């Protein structure tokens, strides 16, 4: 067992610290831990090893020191390429077992406004005898968004699919929501609103049948 | 550079097998340990297993929630090391990472997708966004392809078979309470009149070996 702290905040160009806390009996009589940096939806990286060391191919500002139960990282200088999620892990000699810790993550401080696409059924879903509006929600921070549809002026919570943000290659946030109708529904009003809310402000797409 | 490729990912049911290959690259197969590591769908790292080299008569280790149902193999020969996973269950669904291990995880591969579930596997359907001026929020055109109605991850998306990725971005995909995925690929494009160039999405849901290439056209 290793255990870590959920979430670590920090601001940019300062130096931040995370806690890899194990026990007397594994890290305390026999110290060697490593340390890895795995960015959303990619593969996990060795920023540090043996405690102490790193590969010419890492990054200078990341580093490691330990007392005797619990091993730490340290990060100098912080950007947003840094935020990411952080794990430590250990392994005795042979008929034994890896440990990892749970996951750890660091944050930066701007702020924007989302990007806001949308599209009506295909003609071709159209003839297929379905319908779907696609909402697409782009480069926005922090993330976090409320996505609402209304069909002419009324609000639609039936057949509503939403994702939860997600950490964009940017460092800001993306998000998708599909609206699913019949093409008779579709055809039946006027207007189809896609309305994003962020910070307490509203961007709104709207689509007709044409 | 050193490459590190997994490949046979997708969907089992509960209780069947399915098992991963690894091919390696740019690193002498023969003297360097493998490893795999597993990331379940929002959790942490959690080791698999390891295989140590021929030299040292090809011993393995594994983690507890692994050990008895998954066996880890080698073939030198062929270049590549062999994931065998024989009784499964849901709590196994994860994202398998094929790594080396030296004297910690030197590297580590793209990760392949095992998602264990009774569910059947579904190819996706694929439709045209017709490009548009008024599709956006923002100042440009966009024009894109819907991919609906998959199970399970990963669909991947291109465009123009890969020569066209400037104006790309490829959203993740929502889970529907269909429980099927749906997913979408916009490009960002001067006008909604697009005359001589050509828009091709490449979807490509390897769990189903299925592949569409869909072009994309101005609405009538």
């Known amino acids: 067992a290793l255990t870590q702290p959920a979430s670590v905040s920090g601001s940019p160009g300062q130096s931040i610290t995370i806690s890899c806390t194990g026990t007397?009996?594994?890290?305390?009589?026999?110290?060697?831990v490593s340390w890895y940096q795995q960015h959303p939806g990619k593969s996990p990286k060795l920023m540090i090893y043996?405690?102490?060391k790193r590969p010419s191919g890492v990054s200078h500002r990341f580093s490691g020191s330990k007392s005797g139960n619990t091993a730490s990282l340290t990060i100098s200088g912080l950007q947003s390429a840094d935020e990411a999620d952080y794990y430590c892990?250990?392994?005795?000699?042979?008929?034994?077992?890896?440990?990892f810790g749970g996951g750890t993550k660091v944050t930066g401080q701007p702020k924007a406004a989302p990007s806001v696409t949308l599209f009506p059924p295909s003609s071709e879903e159209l003839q297929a005898n379905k319908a779907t509006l696609v909402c697409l929600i782009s480069d926005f921070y922090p993330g976090a968004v409320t996505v609402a549809w209304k069909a002419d002026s009324s609000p639609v919570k039936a057949g509503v699919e939403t994702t939860t943000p997600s950490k964009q290659s940017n460092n800001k946030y993306a998000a998708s929501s599909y609206l699913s109708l019949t093409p008779e529904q579709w055809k039946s009003h006027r207007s189809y609103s896609c309305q994003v809310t962020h910070e307490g402000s509203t961007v709104e797409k709207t689509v007709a049948p044409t | 550079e050193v490459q590190l490729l997994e490949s046979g990912g997708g969907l089992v049911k509960p209780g069947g097998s399915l098992r991963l290959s690894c091919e390696a690259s740019?690193?002498?197969?023969?003297?360097?340990?493998m490893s795999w590591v597993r990331q379940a769908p929002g959790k942490g790292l959690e080791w698999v297993g390891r295989?140590?080299?021929?030299?040292?008569?090809?011993?393995?280790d594994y983690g507890a929630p692994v050990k008895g149902r998954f066996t880890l193999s080698r073939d030198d020969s062929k270049n590549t090391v062999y994931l065998q996973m024989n009784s499964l269950k849901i709590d196994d669904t994860a994202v398998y990472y094929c790594?080396?291990?030296?004297?910690?995880?030197?590297?580590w591969g793209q990760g392949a997708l095992v998602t264990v579930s009774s569910a059947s596997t579904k190819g996706p359907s694929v439709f045209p966004l017709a490009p548009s001026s008024k599709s956006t929020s923002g100042g440009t055109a966009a024009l894109g392809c819907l991919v609906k109605d998959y199970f399970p991850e990963p669909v991947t998306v291109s465009w123009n078979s890969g020569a066209l990725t400037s104006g790309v971005h490829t959203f993740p995909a929502v889970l529907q309470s269909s429980g099927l995925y749906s997913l979408s690929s916009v490009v960002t494009v001067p006008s909604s009149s697009l005359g001589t160039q050509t828009y091709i999405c490449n979807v490509n849901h390897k769990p189903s070996n299925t592949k569409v290439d869909k072009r994309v056209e101005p609405k009538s």
């Open positions: 892990c250990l392994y005795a000699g042979s008929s034994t077992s890896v440990i």
């Open positions: 740019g690193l002498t197969f023969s003297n360097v340990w």
């Open positions: 790594s080396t291990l030296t004297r910690y995880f030197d590297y």
């Open positions: 007397s009996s594994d890290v305390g009589t026999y110290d060697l």
């Open positions: 295989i140590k080299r021929k030299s040292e008569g090809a011993t393995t």
């Open positions: 043996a405690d102490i």
